[model samples]
Target: HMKADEMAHRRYCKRTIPPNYRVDQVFGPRTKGKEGNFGDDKMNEEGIKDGRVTAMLNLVPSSHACLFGSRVTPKLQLDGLHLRFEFTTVVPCDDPQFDNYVKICDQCVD
Candidate 1:
């Protein structure tokens, strides 16, 4: 079962935008210090599709924990084909450079 604290992070962080993506309008705009506000979009980028991206989970050697939580289940259409993939999430401390912290994100679409 998923950890209870992890679940709480997921529940409370309805709008957490990871600090890593909040650079130079990369993920649209920053939410000041409230890292848990992602605005109203499944994703803020078009280049992201059916692939992998990375997020830092806002871990900054500490003052307080920034639990940037997210959940994504995608049914995407690309290249005239339908794709259905399982939902997934990641941790900044423990994930390959591929899998996104919240879910899947495409990087090769460009």
Candidate 2:
């Protein structure tokens, strides 16, 4: 049961796409410090003070697509009339490259 719970949580974390992808998720744009306030002034005030200003608010279409883009296309030839094979691998959180994979996924989204 514990292992199953961990698996479920791991999957959830992997699938969860953070809304603040512009700040914490990506590394391209630098969040500004104080600019304007109108929509949700209180929240903006806090974020500006903390230097988490996201001038351009945006979101990726799909996190799954980013993950797919990170991986290389498989080189396979299947001559079957009606047959298909889904290529994938079990990515354990403890793996050394797992963190890098997560970072790459975020980069792709960016």
Candidate 3:
């Protein structure tokens, strides 16, 4: 397990609930129906009250030979072998700081 210089100074954060059209964030995994259902409060019951954000990332690349990072040079097919599963970068939860880290939501969309 190469550390890649301590994960290039590891950094990450996320906690969105905005009016965002929804890019749904990206990196890998979570590409199915994108399952989501926060108690289905009817999505704020048409009141249109929403607020939350805290996106951040730095030096993202789990493995697979830098996985399209560090310049580039990772190509392996192994005779077109089937099955290939390896996903990462989908980390975010709770208070933290860096990038977008915005805040709002004090009961009724502060």
Identify the leading candidate in terms of lDDT.
2
| Overall local distance difference test of candidate 1 | 0.34
- With a 3 Å backbone cut-off (N, CA, C), the pairs that clash in candidate 1 are 15-36, 15-37, 15-38, 16-36, 16-37
The order by descending TM-score is: 2, 3, 1
Report lDDT per candidate. Answer: 0.34, 0.36, 0.32
C-alpha RMSD by candidate, in order: 17.8, 18.0, 14.4
Tens-digit lDDT string for candidate 3 (20-65): 2232221122223343322123233321232222122232354554
Give a tens-digit lDDT track for model 1, residues 18-96.
4323321333342434542343233444222312322433322221222223222345466544323222233464546
Candidate 2 deviant stretches above 4 angstroms: 1-82
TM-scores, each model vs. reference: 0.17, 0.23, 0.19
Which pairs in model 2 have colliding backbones?
none
Residue 95 in candidate 1, Cα distance off native in Å: 18
Worst 10 residues of 2 by lDDT: 52-61
